[PDB]
Design a protein around this ligand. Structure first.
Ligand SMILES: NC(=O)c1ccccc1CC(=O)N1CCC[C@H](C(N)=O)C1
Ligand SMILES: [Zn+2]
Length: 140
């Protein structure tokens, strides 16, 4: 589990959104595994606006932050899970690193701010849902 709190927005994995998230919905995209809801209190995270391919991510199954090199946001094939059938996920970035069912939501960050959140994994890989193209998260 895990979320990004920027301004009056909460960014979570679509597959982990609560009833309260859906009842206060701003935007969602199944093909990116993203959902954004509105909040009463202001958040303290800042979103990166860059093309960094290195950063650090939080892994809850190891209680540790790991440095990683990661691919550019792309259309990648993802195996079936209890949450989605086997399909292509868009705006996804891969890196070599530990991931487990329960690690989705962990933040990926570079020198400029929050890059994205854990969304896929397995086989010694970890996948991140990119949020750097979502410019509207910086206002309203
Ligand atoms: N990091 C993990 O969640 C993980 C790690 C090892 C093995 C498997 C996973 C889980 C995973 O890949 N999922 C299940 C949740 C929905 C995901 C999606 N965005 O389509 C696919
Ligand atoms: Zn950066």
């Amino acid at each position: 589990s895990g979320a990004i709190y920027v301004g009056n927005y909460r960014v979570v994995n679509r597959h982990l959104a609560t009833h309260n998230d859906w009842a206060n919905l701003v935007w969602e995209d199944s093909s990116r595994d993203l959902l954004v809801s509105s909040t009463t209190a202001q958040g303290c995270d800042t979103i990166a606006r860059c093309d960094c391919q290195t950063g650090v991510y939080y892994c809850s199954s190891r209680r540790k932050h790991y440095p990683v090199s990661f691919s550019k946001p792309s259309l990648i094939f993802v195996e079936a899970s209890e949450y989605y059938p086997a399909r292509y996920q868009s705006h996804l970035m891969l890196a070599v690193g530990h991931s487990e069912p329960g690690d989705c939501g962990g933040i990926l960050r570079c020198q400029h701010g929050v890059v994205g959140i854990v969304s896929t994994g397995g086989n010694g890989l970890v996948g991140f849902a990119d949020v750097r193209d979502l410019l509207w998260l910086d206002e309203e």
